[model samples]
Target: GMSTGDFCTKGIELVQKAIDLDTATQYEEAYTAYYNGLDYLMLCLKYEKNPKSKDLIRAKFTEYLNRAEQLKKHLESEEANAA
Candidate 1:
């Protein structure tokens, strides 16, 4: 009954949580959520067969990935500043 859709659902849910955490300025938790969310989405993409849907997933993944990477750099810079 379920396949890549499950991963997509979970990924989106985690991404949503990450967005909320990001909005709340919980950088640490948000980063973690974004990381795992991307992980699931990548898996979904790996098994994705439909071209159109795969394109959409790639778009969403790129958006989330960019934010995740930005958060990572932001955290690293903060740590450096603290030291």
Candidate 2:
């Protein structure tokens, strides 16, 4: 039910917040923000009606999801090694 622009804007904000937090060494918060951003982007893809818009957003969502998955794997590996 959300507008495409609104979804994109929110996603962008979350990604930027993640970057800012990461820069400040807030890794947990940055990870949370990245996940949040990915969620927002995926939601946009799910709700988008226009074919062109949907395709564009879906591509972006996929990219974000892929990056998130890689980061999650890295974090899990780090945790496992630490333990």
Candidate 3:
């Protein structure tokens, strides 16, 4: 149901959605989406054909992974700040 090229697009859109959630301070939810997004990009990175696209997917994967970790940390530090 996906390909390297398609997966890259999916990953990009997923990251954008995650960022929107992150902007809303929905860190935990964004983190989950970002982590899943990483899986999609990783699939792209694994099966990509063109050299440039592979590089782009790899770069995006790293970017989202870092942002996802940041969201995770932010969520942890947010304990009961709302509850």
Candidate 4:
């Protein structure tokens, strides 16, 4: 439980911060937060005991990954546009 809960705490905290940055349209900052949070959540998922909850955790993980990828593409596009 210590292993799982520790990662969960870190994941959720950064995810919350990522959301705030995302809302502010600070895509780069939000992307980094989401990336780190997802990393922790992945570890949390591996350490998760409850099967049903693990699925939910994976669902959220996918959602975060999608958003992170979108930001990455956005950054790439802007970089190309500036060039």
Candidate 5:
């Protein structure tokens, strides 16, 4: 439980930080934070004890993934526009 618990806790924190960055329109930073959070959550799923818990983690992971993808696309568009 040591690594799993720690990962889950930190993952949640990182996701929240991602949200804060997103709100401030720091899409590049938010993209990295969300990606990091998804990595942490993915590691935690292996040790999750219940289906419900695992589902919750999956849901959060999806949320992060979606946001990360959106930010990535947004960033790419701006870069292309500048080019």
Candidate 6:
């Protein structure tokens, strides 16, 4: 049974893991994990404190969006080569 805190902790851990994999040059895996982490973080962000959490969520969401875009481009390039 997962508690609320468990979700938050898992989100943080996923973000850290993504960072580690990213630093190791595992771009595809890192991006996938990043998207998962962003999803979890957004869940917590919904019930977070105002102002501070709002700003933080906004920034984090923007970062996630940018990374997702990069991943999409990479996937498209790969598909183009395969076709």
Q: What TM-score would every model get versus the actual structure?
A: 0.90, 0.70, 0.84, 0.91, 0.91, 0.71
Give a tens-digit lDDT track for model 2, residues 2-78.
67779877987897887788678776777788899988877777777788977886777677667667667777898
Those runs of model 4 whose alpha carbons end farther than 4 Å from true positions after fitting are none
* Residue-level lDDT tens digits of model 4 in 1-83: 46687888899899989989999999999999999999999998989898987898899999999999999999999999999
Model 4, poorest ten-residue lDDT window? 1-10
Candidate 6 on 1-83: residue-level lDDT in tens?
Answer: 97555665677788788878878878788888888888877776775656675677668767876876787688779889999
lDDT of each: 0.93, 0.78, 0.83, 0.92, 0.90, 0.75
lDDT pick, better of 1 and 2: 1
Better candidate by TM-score, 1 or 3:
1
Which clashing pairs does model 2 show? none
Clashes of each: 0, 0, 0, 0, 0, 0
Q: Residue 79 CA error for candidate 2 (Å)? A: 0.9
Q: Between 1 and 2, whose TM-score is larger?
A: 1
Give the candidate number with the greatest lDDT.
1
Ranking by TM-score: 4, 5, 1, 3, 6, 2
lDDT of 1 at 54: 85
- Write down the RMSD of all candidates, one decimal each: 1.5, 2.7, 1.9, 1.5, 1.4, 2.5
Error of 4 at 38 (Å): 0.4
Among all windows of 10 consecutive residues in model 5, the one with the lowest summed lDDT is 1-10
